[PDB]
Design a protein around this ligand. Structure first.
Ligand SMILES: C[S@@+](CC[C@H](N)C(=O)[O-])C[C@H]1O[C@@H](n2cnc3c(N)ncnc32)[C@H](O)[C@@H]1O
Length: 208
């Protein structure tokens, strides 16, 4: 018997249990405390900023996009609404199930994202753009490095990441940029969401 479950299992079990209930609420509608409300608003800003980047490029309709660690589809759904071909995945079956429910309710039989329960490190195939928002916060830098390298291998052109700049882990921007550089990516656009209880640094990386 192990002294500890691996980080992925701990995170997965959390988002399949009480984490599902708490984050479905934060990412959804209904009463929240002022801390949770701040997180809801901040996270919405991060999502909206990324959608805005992709819309601004003019090539979003028909674009193949991987949304790794998609949660309840907060990013996947608006990208699909804008015409992207979205492939969302999450390690938590509960989060994935909710994403599909929310998608079916608002998109019906139109351009829906495709949702799969899977560890992002096990994803295959190739995409124009790979996106991983507010997921790396759950892993130490060493593991985050391996995750970024795997995501990079799926990205033909672009990788977009967000992280808390230096349970929960902060990452040094210098470290994240180094890992991206090691994988053959240069930094293009960047962003930053800063509220009272929510901090998310956003990097757009493009294959050079
Ligand atoms: C804070 S939520 C962010 C969700 C989504 N990216 C968003 O911004 O709306 C973190 C999500 O990452 C997922 N996650 C954590 N580790 C993962 C992994 N190794 N592979 C895929 N998803 C993972 C969790 O299940 C959780 O749904």
């Amino acid at each position: 018997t192990n002294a500890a479950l691996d980080d992925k299992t701990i995170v997965r079990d959390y988002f399949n249990s009480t984490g599902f209930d708490r984050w479905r609420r934060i990412y959804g509608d209904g009463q929240v405390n002022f801390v949770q409300k701040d997180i809801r608003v901040g996270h919405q800003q991060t999502v909206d900023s990324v959608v805005a980047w992709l819309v601004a490029d003019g090539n979003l309709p028909g674009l193949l996009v991987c949304d790794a660690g998609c949660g309840v589809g907060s990013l996947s759904i608006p990208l699909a609404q804008a015409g992207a071909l979205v492939y969302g995945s999450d390690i938590s079956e509960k989060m994935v199930g909710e994403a599909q429910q929310k998608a079916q309710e608002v998109l019906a039989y139109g351009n829906q994202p495709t949702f799969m329960t899977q560890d992002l490190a096990q994803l295959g195939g190739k995409y124009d753009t790979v996106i991983c928002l507010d997921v790396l916060i759950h892993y130490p830098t060493e593991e985050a490095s391996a995750m970024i390298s795997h995501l990079a291998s799926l990205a033909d052109r672009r990788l977009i990441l967000s992280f808390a700049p230096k349970r929960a882990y902060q990452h040094k921007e210098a470290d994240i940029r180094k890992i991206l550089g090691d994988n053959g990516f240069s930094i293009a656009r960047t962003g930053m969401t800063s509220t009272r209880f929510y901090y998310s640094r956003i990097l757009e990386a493009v294959r050079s």
